[PDB]
Amino acid sequence: MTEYKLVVVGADGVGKSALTIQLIQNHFVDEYDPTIEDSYRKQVVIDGETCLLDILDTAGQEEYSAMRDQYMRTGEGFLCVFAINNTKSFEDIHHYREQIKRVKDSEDVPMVLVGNKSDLPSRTVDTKQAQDLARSYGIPFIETSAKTRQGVDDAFYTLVREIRKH
């Protein structure tokens, strides 16, 4: 049975754990320790292939743990998440994408740009800033809400599709 090794990256606070917990447990968690970094496993059928996702929900960025360095080096695809009401999280995407590029000595790494918290009012990052950035990197952009679950499956399934394509 095929396994897809996925890494969820992005600023503290943007919804990486909430998105992961939606996928795994189908509920929205309001507070999940922002310091917990761990891996989760989910068996799913995507385009008629029963597969296993092995997902690292990252937490303590730049404080090097041997589990993160390994998923960094061995991860096959990356969800790069910012929050649409957090300008700074969106500006930070560059740094994450740069860390991914450096570790893979490649600009062709399976990646999806995720704009989360779509359910929130008066976003500060316009859809157009997100589309232009994903167009520049050559990757899909998917808007999500961990709260309502909109886009959550589509983000992870599209990443799996990007791994296949690569």
Ligand SMILES: Nc1nc2c(ncn2[C@@H]2O[C@H](COP(=O)(O)OP(=O)(O)O)[C@@H](O)[C@H]2O)c(=O)[nH]1
């Ligand atoms: N309204 C709303 N809140 C969210 C969403 N995703 C996460 N959150 C909230 O934002 C906070 C940060 O989420 P969390 O998953 O801890 O962020 P992480 O540091 O990126 O793991 C938590 O209070 C979550 O309830 C979302 O899609 N919509």
Ligand SMILES: [Mg+2]
């Ligand atoms: Mg977290």
